[PDB]
Amino acid sequence: ANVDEAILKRVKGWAPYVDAKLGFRNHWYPVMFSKEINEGEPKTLKLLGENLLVNRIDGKLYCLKDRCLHRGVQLSVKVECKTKSTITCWYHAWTYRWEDGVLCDILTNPTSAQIGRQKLKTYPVQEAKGCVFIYLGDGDPPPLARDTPPNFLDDDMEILGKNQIIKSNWRLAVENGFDPSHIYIHKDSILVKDNDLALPLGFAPGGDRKQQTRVVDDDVVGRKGVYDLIGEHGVPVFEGTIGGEVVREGAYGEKIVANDISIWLPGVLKVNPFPNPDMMYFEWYVPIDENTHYYFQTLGKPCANDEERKKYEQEFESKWKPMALEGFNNDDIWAREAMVDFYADDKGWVNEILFESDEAIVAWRKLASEHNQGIQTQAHVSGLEHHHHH
């Protein structure tokens, strides 16, 4: 579909996942924070290869595809919102309603037969925890909870974080995050020392294949994910050796973090607890196009009143964000970028030589392949193509 058939035929265990270069269609995805989109100020962004426009009208968010139906120009080149509820293309003035995308007027020809008969693509938009989620799919959307990690939506959970664009396919980010052994790249992180954390270098697996993880496909909310249970039967490595001689040691701090790690469709990781014993971490790797993704980082900490929320925010701004989101996760950024060349030609999916701890990643590839709600294709981007019965 999006990949050479010869390669897909080889990856029998997770072809759909390898084919999903542009991401999975029909899932909710966070793209920005609520405070970034103001009333009557349309904002552009690209999601799953599609150029979109988001506007806030009377406090509510609406999403329209940023491409006029007429000659395919982006409306955002020159935004003309002539009435509260509509946007007028700057080229020939085709006008659309934000709420349903219907072509309601055409200033260059108010008698056109196209008026009332065409509809610009719209996408559901929902705000939660100060985050803007867009359902990049068709038909009525499922509840947001289906595409979020457990507890992210808890009433008491105060969510704070950051978002930025990273140069790598979304899947490389996902597998970097859910990777049990990549913890090695974090051995010198300031968070480890400055927050006195206990962090091994790796893990020596124990038990059988199935015991290595917990596949979730019976979640009442419809959630689909995988829990990494490598430390349940595997002795953590705190002394790295070569030829028997110790060359590196893990961190021997007091704080126990990352008791459980889980990856959830459409591509969101949950680390609990982290970066502190009393916090929860959630990060999304949102597909922008085949080479880029939004690295949406969120940190959650229970709060009962405004006082706690502010203390948390102050704490976030002064310690967490700079020491964790950045001081810790920045190494993940160049790490996923380092895998680009190997997988760029899709050959990495065949030549990779995996080892024991990748058992978790394999489980994810299979779950993603079996439970995704659709494979986004370039045709979805340019315009679906078909000849019905043929």
Binding site: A113, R117, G383, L384, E385, H386, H387, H388
Partner: protein, 104 residues
């Protein structure tokens, strides 16, 4: 209520005939074998005249971009078309084709 199109015999199976209506949009009359059908002449995807297209069985292909519709149901058969075509009632009485003034 009805308009005189032509003699059922003036149309060979698999052919299209445009019907220009005074003060109104044009219609298209297709003969699929021995059954007649009618829809708006203008393709819903643009401004093309379907009567200038190609009829394959009961599917009309637009000459502009290759979009297509089922002439019986008026439903899109091939991309890029997505908007249903208005279908008009057709009646044959005494060897003559008649098309309804308004769509069904």
């Amino acid at each position: 209520i009805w308009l005189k199109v032509c003699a059922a015999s003036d149309m060979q199976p698999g052919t299209i005939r445009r019907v220009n209506r005074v003060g109104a949009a044009p219609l298209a009359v297709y003969r699929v074998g021995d059954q007649f059908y009618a829809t708006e002449d203008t393709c819903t995807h643009g401004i093309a005249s379907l009567s200038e297209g190609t009829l394959d069985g009961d599917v009309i292909e637009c000459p502009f971009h290759g979009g297509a519709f089922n002439v019986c149901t008026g439903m899109p058969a091939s991309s890029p078309c997505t908007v249903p075509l208005g279908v008009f009632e057709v009646e044959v009485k005494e060897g003559e084709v008649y098309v309804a003034g308004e769509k069904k």
